[PDB]
Amino acid sequence: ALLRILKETEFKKIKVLGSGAFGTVYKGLWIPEGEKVKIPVAIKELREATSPKANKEILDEAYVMASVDNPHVCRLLGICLTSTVQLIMQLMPFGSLLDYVREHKDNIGSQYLLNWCVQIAKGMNYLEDRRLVHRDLAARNVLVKTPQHVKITDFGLVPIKWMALESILHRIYTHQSDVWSYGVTVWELMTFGSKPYDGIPASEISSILEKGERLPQPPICTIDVYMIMRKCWMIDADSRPKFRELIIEFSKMARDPQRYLVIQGDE
Numbered sequence: 001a002l003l004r005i006l007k008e009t010e011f012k013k014i015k016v017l018g019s020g021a022f023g024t025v026y027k028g029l030w031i032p033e034g035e036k037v038k039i040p041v042a043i044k045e046l047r048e049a050t051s052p053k054a055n056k057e058i059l060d061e062a063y064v065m066a067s068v069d070n071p072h073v074c075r076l077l078g079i080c081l082t083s084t085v086q087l088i089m090q091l092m093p094f095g096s097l098l099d100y101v102r103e104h105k106d107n108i109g110s111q112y113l114l115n116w117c118v119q120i121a122k123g124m125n126y127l128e129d130r131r132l133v134h135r136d137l138a139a140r141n142v143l144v145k146t147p148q149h150v151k152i153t154d155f156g157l158v159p160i161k162w163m164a165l166e167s168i169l170h171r172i173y174t175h176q177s178d179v180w181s182y183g184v185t186v187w188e189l190m191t192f193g194s195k196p197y198d199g200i201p202a203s204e205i206s207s208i209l210e211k212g213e214r215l216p217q218p219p220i221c222t223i224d225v226y227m228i229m230r231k232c233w234m235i236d237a238d239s240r241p242k243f244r245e246l247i248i249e250f251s252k253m254a255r256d257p258q259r260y261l262v263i264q265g266d267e
């Protein structure tokens with residue numbers, strides 16, 4: 001439930017997974033005080049600019065992150081306060097889903113792929129229920145705990161291609177706007193990590209959306225599935241399918257993946 005405050009001694013950071021302007025992420029081992037067991041963890045350290053106002057804002061968000069409780073939604077285990085701010089999240093061994101599909105493109109299966117979409121939709125629904133807008137749904141932001149299990153992280157805090165036209169044009173973010181991002185995320189999985197609008201300038205993208213052009217239907221997927229992706233990118237936000245609704249369609253599709261999705265040779 002609550003977010004633990006962690007003593008510096010409690011955890012050690014083994015290696016650095018990623019570097020960002022906002023913060024640098026590390027892979028680490030955390031041993032809870034009073035517990036024999038050692039847990040692998042992902043640690044994020046804010047790069048700079050600590051401010052009293054900033055610290056309060058950061059803390060406030062941290063509590064909510066800790067509060068979230070869903071199987072497909074990442075939860076912030078704890079925060080460590082010292083000179084720098086570090087956020088502790090349980091490590092996902094596999095890494096980002098986008099990276100996973102990219103190096104495992106040859107061996108992936110439709111059932112796994114269809115199942116991932118359902119899981120993301122389920123995760124998204126919890127956020128909608130909790131009145132949280134992710135604001136940056138992407139393939140990278142989906143973490144692979146295991147092939148069978150996937151989770152969503154970094155919600156609640158630009159990626160022009162991923163974001164909805166409404167958001168781009170008027171800086172408007174809503175759950176429906178997140179659905180447009182969700183459709184793009186599905187496209188990434190379907191296309192095995194191909195970058196959307198590859199070689200296209202960010203500035204141009206808004207005009208293209210206005211023109212009705214959309215990302216190309218993936219070779220692997222069936223016609224019905226492509227329609228779901230298109231629905232997400234439709235201009236009317238209300239017209240776009242609800243997340244709860246999305247779960248049902250994918251789940252039905254999940255039962256017989258081969259019909260809906262055709263890739264290589266599969267059972």
Ligand SMILES: O=C(Nc1nccs1)[C@@H](c1cc(F)ccc1O)N1Cc2ccccc2C1=O
Pocket residue numbers: 025026042043044058059061062065074075076077087088089152153154155156157
């Ligand atoms: O912790 C996060 N990412 C990490 N990378 C390596 C280890 S944790 C990320 C986050 C974690 C989570 F469980 C769920 C949603 C999230 O958005 N958060 C949370 C938070 C709170 C206050 C200020 C900044 C951040 C921030 O960046």
